[PDB]
Design a protein around this ligand. Structure first.
Ligand SMILES: *[C@@H]1O[C@H](CO[C@@H]2O[C@@H](C)[C@@H](O)[C@@H](O)[C@@H]2O)[C@@H](O[C@@H]2O[C@H](CO)[C@@H](O)[C@H](O)[C@H]2NC(C)=O)[C@H](O)[C@H]1NC(C)=O
Lengths: 132, 195
């Protein structure tokens, strides 16, 4: 029902910046929390950031972050386009992974955090960080 | 307990031609990368997905060491996402590359008065190499619309070209020995760790 397509990955020097986009096709996306996960080689998928669904009559937005990316990374949601962004500053080599976009129907301002708690997934975009 | 045979790779007498690059898989050993990052000999030591300083702290299932010789201008092609004769036709790194590219000027070893013609590179190919794919074939390349019948001629080229390393070459055209270390991390017991 929900199709997710990531974009914006690539190679970047340690300390540089990157901005990922994920667009969601489907009406179910508006009533879905959306988030970012990443998967380094040989590791399981782990939470990066999440943002609450669209809620009628309120402008309040709930988000959630993995602690090791607080401040460096920012998740944002576009108004009435159902696209989410992950602004990635101060990148470290250990940030290298495939970055996945995810969407999950939910109620209220809940932001899920486990990968098994999101139904819909993108294909992933590769982020590689180099260091001299 | 036994140390990883990184000396066999970095200090090998002869290096492979880039079109026929060499690979050694390293496992079940203790890796001291400090000999590498501390040394001042290397002119390139760029890592991807790892910090060079923390290499002794990491553990991997396997470490791969690919080694060959290219000229100085082409060391840059040894990086993910690169394009060019070396990256497209000789040695290609994947986009999800985790490892380090190490290179150093070898003019005193791999050039000779009159020219060293033992080091070759592939100059044409019908399509790009896949990541870590190797092509050691030697068939005449058809650059035009007319068949070559296996012999050189107009628009029909021998696919391998010689580097012709002379000691007086500009530094861009001097031989550089390259070692690419790939760190493979899997859902499996790590067998290469630091001290
Ligand atoms: C590659 O070899 C260098 C130099 O090797 C030296 O000379 C050889 C002929 C042989 O006698 C070696 O045993 C010699 O060490 C190594 O650099 C040396 O490393 C040791 C230990 O770190 C250090 O004490 C020496 O001072 C170094 N010498 C120089 C000139 O730098 C290098 O470690 C070898 N590379 C690898 C990956 O093992």
């Amino acid at each position: 029902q929900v199709q997710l397509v990531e974009s914006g990955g690539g190679l970047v020097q340690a300390g540089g910046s990157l901005r990922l986009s994920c667009s969601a096709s489907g009406g179910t996306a508006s009533r879905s929390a959306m988030g970012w996960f990443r998967q380094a080689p040989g590791k399981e998928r782990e939470f990066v950031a999440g943002i609450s669904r669209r809620n009628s009559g309120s402008t309040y937005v709930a988000d959630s972050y993995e602690d090791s990316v607080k401040g460096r990374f920012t998740i944002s949601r576009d108004n009435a386009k159902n696209t989410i962004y992950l602004q990635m500053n101060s990148l470290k080599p250990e940030d290298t992974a495939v970055y996945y976009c995810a969407a999950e129907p939910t109620l209220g301002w809940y932001v899920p955090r486990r990968s098994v708690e999101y139904e819909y997934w993108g294909q992933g975009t590769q982020v590689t960080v180099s260091s001299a | 307990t036994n140390l990883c045979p990184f000396g066999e790779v970095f200090n090998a007498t002869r290096f492979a031609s880039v079109y026929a690059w060499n690979r050694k898989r390293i496992s079940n050993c203790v890796a001291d990368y400090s000999v590498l990052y501390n040394s001042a000999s290397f002119s390139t030591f760029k890592c991807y997905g790892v910090s060079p300083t923390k290499l002794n702290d990491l553990c991997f299932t396997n470490v791969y060491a690919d080694s060959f010789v290219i000229r100085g201008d082409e060391v840059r092609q040894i990086a993910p996402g690169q394009t060019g004769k070396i990256a497209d036709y000789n040695y290609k790194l994947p986009d999800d590359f985790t490892g380090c590219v190490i290179a150093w000027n070898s003019n005193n070893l791999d050039s000779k008065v009159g020219g060293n013609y033992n080091y070759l590179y592939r100059l044409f190919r019908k399509s790009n190499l896949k990541p870590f794919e190797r092509d050691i074939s030697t068939e005449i390349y058809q650059a035009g619309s007319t068949p070559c019948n296996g012999v050189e001629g107009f628009n029909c080229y021998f696919p391998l070209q010689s580097y012709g390393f002379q000691p007086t070459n500009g530094v861009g055209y001097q031989p550089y020995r390259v070692v690419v270390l790939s760190f493979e991390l899997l859902h499996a017991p790590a067998t290469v760790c630091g001290p």
